[PDB]
């Protein structure tokens, strides 16, 4: 495996180089939007982001070492966590707002336009606020995103010591986080505290993803918000 041979700096460089781009929405201020069509902007955006995420995942060290079945499973488990942590990252500098796209910046007032989204909105805002107070670094963010990809579906016969390989890569990403923090001049106590602070965020990201998946399944059944074939297949994986 190439993943296990990388140094911490080579790991960060690889992850930084694999970053997907920030996409634009189809939002138009002159166009009236309904709750349905505003949510349409977000599901259309997420669909386009998913294509980039799939090709990003191939560049996460260790991910292509896995079978195709396992790669499918990890992305089916983690895709909304990964979209959401990216959303939170790019919203850091916009307190009280979510930057879905450079042309789509929404506050809580617009989050209440669609019913049932206010809570998820507020949770995303709280997570971004937490990143801002921690002064989360881009190098730490790309580490957290790869951990989500590898970790979120690892616990969902003989052959599969694939789980062992995933665990050794995750250990390497932990080493990489600690190296970043040591270079930031943190004391060892501060390094362990910050590492814990970052990993506990992942629990909240998991929570928000689960709640988002529930509302997404609801939006499908209402059959008013367009959902792409890929989104429907991703959503279907979380139901069976």
């Amino acid at each position: 495996s190439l993943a296990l041979s990388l140094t911490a700096d080579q790991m960060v460089s690889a992850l930084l180089d694999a970053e997907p781009p920030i996409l634009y929405s189809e939002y138009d201020p002159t166009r009236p939007f309904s709750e349905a069509s505003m949510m349409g902007l977000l599901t259309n955006l997420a669909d386009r982001e998913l294509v980039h995420m799939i090709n990003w995942a191939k560049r996460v060290p260790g991910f292509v070492d896995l079978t195709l079945h396992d790669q499918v499973h990890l992305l089916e488990c983690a895709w909304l966590e990964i979209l959401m942590i990216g959303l939170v990252w790019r919203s850091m500098e916009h307190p009280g707002k979510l930057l879905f796209a450079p042309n789509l910046l929404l506050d809580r007032n617009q989050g209440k336009c669609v019913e049932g989204m206010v809570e998820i909105f507020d949770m995303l805002l709280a997570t971004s606020s937490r990143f801002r107070m921690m002064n989360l670094q881009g190098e730490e963010f790309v580490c957290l995103k790869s951990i989500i990809l590898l970790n979120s579906g690892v616990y969902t016969l003989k052959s599969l010591e694939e789980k062992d390989h995933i665990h050794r890569v995750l250990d390497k990403i932990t080493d990489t986080l600690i190296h970043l923090m040591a270079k930031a001049g943190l004391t060892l106590q501060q390094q362990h505290q910050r590492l814990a602070q970052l990993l506990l965020i992942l629990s909240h990201i998991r929570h928000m993803s689960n709640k988002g998946m529930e509302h997404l399944y609801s939006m499908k059944c209402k059959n008013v918000v367009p959902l792409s074939d890929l989104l429907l297949e991703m959503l279907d994986a979380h139901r069976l």
């Binding site: 294509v51 090709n55 992305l75 890929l230």
Partner: peptide
């Protein structure tokens, strides 16, 4: 299966 095909391409 779309995700399967995109990972294979």
């Amino acid at each position: 299966k779309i995700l399967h095909r995109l990972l294979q391409d």
